[PDB]
């Protein structure tokens, strides 16, 4: 399927144990997509002070359209030293590995895969 319904655990930035997906734009997009398929991906909501507490390159989920079955359609955009790889809508948050942190909420998305 071109899209997959996922329910992403929303993590507090100070709880995150693994603060990014790797060391290159291509690696972080690759690893993010793998962790999304394996159900091992968390979401951190972006506010003042969040991104400097995480590791670049960043992987964002961005709204791709204006929401089937309660799932917002999203796509992945990476960022490294102020340059983005991909073009999309509003950021829903930054993706991180999930390794058992307790979430505060879930974000239902339809991921363009």
From Swiss-Prot:
Q: What, per the annotation, is the impact of changing residue 37 to R?
A: In strain: Omicron/XBB.1.5, Omicron/EG.5.1
Which top-level group of life is the source organism from? Viruses
Q: Where is it localised? A: Host cytoplasm
- CoV Nsp1 globular domain residues: 2-113
Stretches the record annotates as Disordered: 1-113
Annotated coiled-coil segments of the chain: none
Q: What does this protein do?
A: Inhibits host translation by associating with the open head conformation of the 40S subunit. The C-terminus binds to and obstructs ribosomal mRNA entry tunnel. Thereby inhibits antiviral response triggered by innate immunity or interferons. The nsp1-40S ribosome complex further induces an endonucleolytic cleavage near the 5'UTR of host mRNAs, targeting them for degradation. This inhibits the integrated stress response (ISR) in the infected cell by preventing EIF2S1/eIF2-alpha phosphorylation upstream of stress granule formation and depletes host G3BP1.
Would you tell me the protein name for this molecule? Host translation inhibitor nsp1
From what organism does this protein derive? Severe acute respiratory syndrome coronavirus 2
* Gene name, Swiss-Prot/TrEMBL: rep
Coverage of the whole protein, first to last residue?
11 to 125 of 7096
């Amino acid at each position: 399927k071109t899209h997959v319904q996922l329910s992403l655990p929303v993590l507090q930035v100070r709880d995150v144990l693994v603060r990014g997906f790797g060391d290159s734009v291509e690696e972080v997009l690759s690893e993010a997509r793998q962790h999304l398929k394996d159900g091992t991906c968390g979401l951190v909501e972006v506010e003042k002070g969040v991104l400097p507490q995480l590791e670049q390159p960043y992987v964002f989920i961005k709204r791709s359209d204006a929401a089937p079955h309660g799932h917002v359609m999203v796509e992945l955009v990476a960022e490294l030293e102020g340059i983005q790889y991909g073009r999309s809508g509003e950021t829903l948050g930054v993706l991180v590995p999930h390794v058992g942190e307790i979430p505060v909420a879930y974000r239902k998305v339809l991921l363009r895969k």
